[PDB]
Amino acid sequence: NFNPTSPLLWFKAIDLESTTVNKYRVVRKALQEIPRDEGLWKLAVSFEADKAQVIKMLEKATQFIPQSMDLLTAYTNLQSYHNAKMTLNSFRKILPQEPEIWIISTLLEERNNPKLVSLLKEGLLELSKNGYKATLSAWLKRAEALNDAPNSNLTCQAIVYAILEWLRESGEYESELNNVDQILEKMPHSKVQIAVLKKLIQWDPCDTVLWSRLKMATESYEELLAFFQELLFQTSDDIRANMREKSPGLLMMYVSEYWKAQKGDTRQTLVLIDQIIDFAPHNLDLRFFKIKLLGRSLQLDELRDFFQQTFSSLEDFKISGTERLYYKYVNFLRYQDLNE
Numbered sequence: 392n393f394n395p396t397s398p399l400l401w402f403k404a405i406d407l408e409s410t411t412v413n414k415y416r417v418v419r420k421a422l423q424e425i426p427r428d429e430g431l432w433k434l435a436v437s438f439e440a441d442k443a444q445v446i447k448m449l450e451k452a453t454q455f456i457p458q459s460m461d462l463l464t465a466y467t468n469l470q471s472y473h474n475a476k477m478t479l480n481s482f483r484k485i486l487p488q489e490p491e492i493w494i495i496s497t498l499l500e501e502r503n504n505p506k507l508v509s510l511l512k513e514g515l516l517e518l519s520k521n522g523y524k525a526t527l528s529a530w531l532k533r534a535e536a537l538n539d540a541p542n543s544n545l546t547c548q549a550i551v552y553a554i555l556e557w558l559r560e561s562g563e564y565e566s567e568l569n570n571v572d573q574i575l576e577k578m579p580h581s582k583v584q585i586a587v588l589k590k591l592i593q594w595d596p597c598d599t600v601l602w603s604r605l606k607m608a609t610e611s612y613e614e615l616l617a618f619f620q621e622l623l624f625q626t627s628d629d630i631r632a633n634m635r636e637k638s639p640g641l642l643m644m645y646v647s648e649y650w651k652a653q654k655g656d657t658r659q660t661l662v663l664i665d666q667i668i669d670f671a672p673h674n675l676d677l678r679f680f681k682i683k684l685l686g687r688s689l690q691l692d693e694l695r696d697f698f699q700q701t702f703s704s705l706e707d708f709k710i711s712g713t714e715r716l717y718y719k720y721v722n723f724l725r726y727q728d729l730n731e
Contacts, residue, residue, distance in 0.1 A: 514553025538583035548586035
């Protein structure tokens with residue numbers, strides 16, 4: 392009566408009242424008296440079993456507290472349509488929402504789960520519309536918890552990508568990247584962190600990142616492999632070149648992964664062959680794994696044929712590191728295994 396405006400009293404009253412109906416009544420009274428108390432609204436939302444009433448309550452809450460995030464999320468959860476989502480967006484677009492409110496929209500979008508490329512577009516749109524405050528890797532921190540939920544990790548990835556793009560547009564920082572890396576390292580064996588790394592890799596050559604990716608995969612105890620496959624297939628046109636230039640252990644890593652995956656020793660062989668074909672000057676490292684596979688399988692004539700094939704290619708490689716010396720030794724060994 393005397394102090395209707397103070398929330399604490401209402402809370403106390405609620406605590407006191409054990410019966411659910413009574414509690415509800417109290418909450419209603421509080422709402423009537425005080426409009427802004429988020430906690431009270433949340434409590435109200437919680438109490439009820441039926442649907443329409445709950446929805447109404449949510450709506451009321453939304454109306455009253457203009458920028459309550461949890462309430463908004465709850466509201467979104469309720470209506471269960473793309474039309475509904477659109478409506479929500481429309482409602483929200485009129486309200487000023489600079490900091491990090493589109494994330495909810497993104498989440499809503501991929502509730503369907505097939506679509507996932509439009510997420511990126513949405514992310515891109517995000518900051519160009521709003522009068523944004525200069526921040527880097529704030530989203531990531533917030534994404535984390537959000538990501539940790541189901542049907543959310545995928546959404547997070549798009550957002551991350553968008554953020555990265557924005558950063559790139561702005562200019563290379565040096566510190567921001569480091570911060571991001573640190574964040575990733577903290578709360579390890581998580582998918583959103585991995586996604587960031589993946590995004591980075593696509594953009595630019597990062598052996599450290601690749602190692603990091605591997606580590607992440609190990610922690611998880613396949614995604615990486617899938618990513619690699621995608622890279623190979625969607626764009627050996629431009630990837631072969633870069634890879635060739637690198638002359639790295641990426642290929643070796645891939646081979647190892649394949650080996651780990653399969654005891655059937657045919658798929659891996661095929662992959663190796665593809666890699667060999669793919670690389671224009673052909674990488675030296677690949678052949679050893681192929682040889683090993685052949686040995687495992689035990690196919691003398693086939694092995695011989697393979698070696699012959701390798702030989703022809705070999706004539707261009709002059710003064711190349713571990714080139715002839717390794718292969719010839721292997722050949723000798725093979726010969727010894729059958730005929731001296």
